[PDB]
C-alpha cells in the first residue's frame, strides 16, 4: 500500500530532549540499508541550531521485523544493539 | 521523449513489458489461445487423474489433425475417445474458418494492390492452392459417388 503507510519508528534518544521537531518527509527517499528497497526517508535535527542531520537509514518494515528504530537501529525497548539483545535472550 | 530517455538512464527499463499483438505475431498468438481452449475442454471431460504429462500428449493430436486438414487427409485415430475426437474436430473447423476467410480477405487486397507484404503474397498463393485442390478433390468424389 503506497497511500496507507505506517508512521516511522524512531527512538526517544534520537529525537532528543526538545518538544517540537520539524521533520522532513521524502516519499521515496534513499533505499534501505538492509533490504535495499526504497522507502520514505525521514530526516530531522534535534535543535534548530544543530549541525547534524539524523536520517532514517532503514525502512519501517526492516525496523518492525527487528523491533529497532530507523535512525540508530537500537532496540525500541532496552535501547541496546541487536547482537547484544539476541545474546541476552 | 527525452524525459523517457533520462528516466530510463536513472532507473532502467521496466520488467513488465507486455507486448501488444501485431501483424508480426498474430499467427503466434492465435495458436496460444487455440491450444489453451482445446486443453481446457479436454481436461473438463476427463473423469480424474490427468497431469502435465497427459495434457502434453493430447495437444499433439490437435496439431496432427490440422496437418491432415491441410493435406485433405481424413484424420481418424484408432482408439480415440468419441467425446475427445468431437472436441478436436470442433476446433479444427474453427481454425479452418479463420484460415479460409483470411485467404479470401487477403486475395481481395492483392487484387486492389492495397499494401500486401511480400511474404503474404507467397502465403496467400500457398493457401489458395490448397483450397483449389481441396475443391478439386471434393469435385472428384462427387462424380465417383
Amino acid at each position: 500500500d503506497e497511500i496507507n503507510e505506517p508512521p516511522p519508528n524512531i527512538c526517544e534518544q534520537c529525537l532528543g530532549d526538545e518538544a517540537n521537531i520539524r521533520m522532513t518527509k521524502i516519499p521515496q527517499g534513499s533505499e534501505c540499508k538492509i533490504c535495499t528497497l526504497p522507502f520514505t526517508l525521514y530526516h530531522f535535527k534535534t535543535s534548530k541550531r544543530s549541525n547534524n542531520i539524523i536520517k532514517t537509514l532503514i525502512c519501517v518494515r526492516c525496523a518492525t521485523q527487528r523491533n529497532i528504530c530507523q535512525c540508530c537501529m537500537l532496540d525500541s525497548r532496552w535501547h541496546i544493539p541487536i547482537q547484544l539483545r539476541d545474546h541476552l535472550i | 521523449y527525452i524525459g523517457n530517455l533520462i528516466t530510463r538512464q536513472f532507473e532502467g527499463r521496466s520488467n513488465e513489458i507486455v507486448k501488444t499483438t501485431t501483424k508480426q505475431r498474430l499467427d503466434a498468438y492465435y495458436d496460444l489461445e487455440l491450444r489453451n481452449s482445446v486443453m481446457d475442454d479436454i481436461l473438463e471431460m476427463m473423469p480424474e487423474s490427468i497431469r502435465q504429462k497427459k495434457a502434453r500428449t493430447i495437444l499433439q493430436h490437435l496439431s496432427e489433425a490440422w496437418r491432415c486438414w491441410k493435406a485433405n487427409i481424413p484424420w481418424d485415430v484408432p482408439g480415440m475417445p468419441a467425446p475427445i475426437k468431437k472436441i478436436i474436430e470442433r476446433y479444427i473447423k474453427s481454425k479452418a474458418d479463420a484460415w479460409v476467410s483470411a485467404a479470401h480477405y487477403n486475395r481481395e487486397r492483392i487484387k486492389r494492390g492495397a499494401h500486401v507484404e511480400k511474404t503474404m503474397v507467397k502465403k496467400n498463393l500457398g493457401r489458395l492452392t490448397r483450397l483449389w485442390i481441396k475443391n478439386e478433390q471434393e469435385r472428384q468424389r462427387q462424380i465417383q459417388k
Binding site: - | 501488444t20 498468438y29 474436430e89
Partner: protein, 357 residues
C-alpha cells in the same frame, strides 16, 4: 419424523441424512413455464462467443464473436443493425453500460476497448494484460470496469483516466468469469483453479474463497433480485449467498458436462448452457431441473458444433438470446398458454444416491 429423533437421538437434529432428505420432499419447487425456440439468427462468420443486452429500453443486443467483429442485432425483428470491427482476435466478452452510452469489449488480442455508442467509434483504450482478456464487468455506480483473463489477476480500471487502479492477486489459474456487485464483496470471480473468490476491493484481498467445485468454474451469473450468485463447474451448479459467502443451494445438474454459460431471470429461472448442446432450465430457489432441451445445428455442420457458448436474458426476462458454435444466434421463447397442468415439467424427485442435496 419424531421417531428418528427419539431413537437415533441427534446432537443437531438437522445433520442427519434422513432429516435433510425429508425436508426436500416436504417442499415443492415453483412451477415455471417451459421454453421453446422462436428465432434463429445466422449472421456471424465464426462462433458467437458473447452476448450482451441493452440494459436501458431493451431494443438491441450485441454479439461479439470469433470472426473478430461485434454485430448489433435488433431484439424484436431480428435484423442486423450495425457491425463493430476493431479487434484483431476473438471478442470474448462484451458489456454494455446502464449509466453510460459506453460499450466495453475484451478479446484474446490483449485489448480492452471502450466504444462511444453515440458515435460507434473506439475511444478510451486500456492496456496492461499479459495475455488474452476473457471477461468484462461494469461496476454499478462506481465508474469502474473489471477485466480479467489468463493472467490470474483482475485489473480494476478507472474509466476516465484509463489507469490500472487495482490489481487483485489471489488466483492460481486463468480467470474465466468476473462479476461486479455494488457492496462488499464488490468483485466475484471464478477461475480454472476450481475457486470462486469474493473480493474486498479496498484492501485488495479475498473475503472468502469458495473451494466447493471440483474442476474449472467456467461461468457465474448474478441474480437480478435476491442478491446471490450462481457458479457452474463441469458437473455442479451452486447458488451462493453474498455478504456471507454461504452455499445457498446445490442444483440438480447430473451428467450435463461442462456448463459453458449461466443466466438468471427475474422469475427465478436459471439457464445452464452446456457444450453438449443440451440446454436446461432450473428453478433458482430450488435447483429443480424442470426442462431439458437439445438444439438442431444447421443443414450441415459437425456434431461438436451443437454447443451453447453464451447466453443472456433480456430486460423483460421473457426471452433468452443464446449464441452457439454453429455460427447462429438462437432466441428461446417461454411459451404462454401453458399451465401447471399439462406442462408440469420434470418431476421433483430428490434422491439419496446422489449426495448433492
Amino acid at each position: 419424523s419424531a421417531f428418528v429423533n427419539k431413537i437415533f437421538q441427534p446432537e443437531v437434529a438437522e445433520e442427519l441424512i434422513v432429516n435433510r432428505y425429508e425436508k426436500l420432499l416436504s417442499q415443492r419447487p415453483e412451477w415455471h413455464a417451459p421454453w421453446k425456440l422462436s428465432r434463429v439468427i445466422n449472421g456471424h462468420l465464426g462462433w458467437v462467443r458473447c452476448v450482451a443486452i441493452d440494459p436501458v429500453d431493451n431494443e438491441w443486443f450485441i454479439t461479439g464473436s470469433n470472426d473478430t467483429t461485434m454485430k448489433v442485432w435488433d431484439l424484436a425483428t431480428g435484423k442486423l443493425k450495425t457491425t463493430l470491427a476493431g479487434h484483431v482476435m476473438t471478442v470474448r466478452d462484451v458489456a454494455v453500460s446502464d449509466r453510460h452510452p459506453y460499450l466495453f469489449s475484451v478479446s484474446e488480442d490483449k485489448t480492452v476497448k471502450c466504444w462511444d455508442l453515440e458515435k460507434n467509434q473506439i475511444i478510451r483504450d486500456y492496456y496492461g494484460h499479459l495475455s488474452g482478456v476473457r471477461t468484462v464487468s461494469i461496476h454499478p455506480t462506481l465508474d469502474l470496469i473489471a477485466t480479467a483473463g489468463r493472467d490470474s489477476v483482475i485489473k480494476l480500471w478507472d474509466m476516465r483516466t484509463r489507469i490500472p487502479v487495482i490489481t487483485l492477486v489471489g488466483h492460481k489459474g486463468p480467470i474465466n468469469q468476473v462479476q461486479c456487485t455494488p457492496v462488499d464483496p464488490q468483485v466475484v470471480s471464478s477461475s480454472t483453479d476450481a475457486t470462486v473468490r469474493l473480493w474486498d476491493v479496498v484492501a485488495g484481498k479475498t473475503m472468502k474463497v469458495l473451494t466447493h467445485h471440483k474442476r474449472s468454474v467456467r461461468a457465474t451469473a448474478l441474480h437480478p433480485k435476491e442478491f446471490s450468485v450462481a457458479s457452474a463447474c463441469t458437473d455442479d451448479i451452486r447458488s451462493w449467498g453474498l455478504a456471507e459467502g454461504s452455499l445457498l443451494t446445490n442444483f440438480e445438474s447430473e451428467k450435463t458436462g461442462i456448463i459453458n454459460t449461466l443466466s438468471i431471470n427475474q422469475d427465478d429461472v436459471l439457464f445452464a448452457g452446456g457444450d453438449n448442446g443440451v440446454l436446461s432450465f432450473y428453478d433458482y430457489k430450488s435447483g429443480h431441473k424442470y426442462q431439458s432441451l437439445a438444439t438442431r445445428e444447421m443443414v450441415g455442420s459437425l456434431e461438436g458444433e451443437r454447443s451453447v457458448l453464451c447466453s443472456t436474458f433480456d430486460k423483460t426476462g421473457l426471452r433468452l438470446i443464446t449464441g452457439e458454435a454453429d455460427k447462429s444466434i438462437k432466441i428461446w421463447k417461454q411459451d404462454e398458454t401453458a399451465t401447471k397442468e399439462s406442462e408440469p415439467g420434470l418431476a421433483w424427485n430428490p434422491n439419496l444416491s446422489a449426495k448433492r442435496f
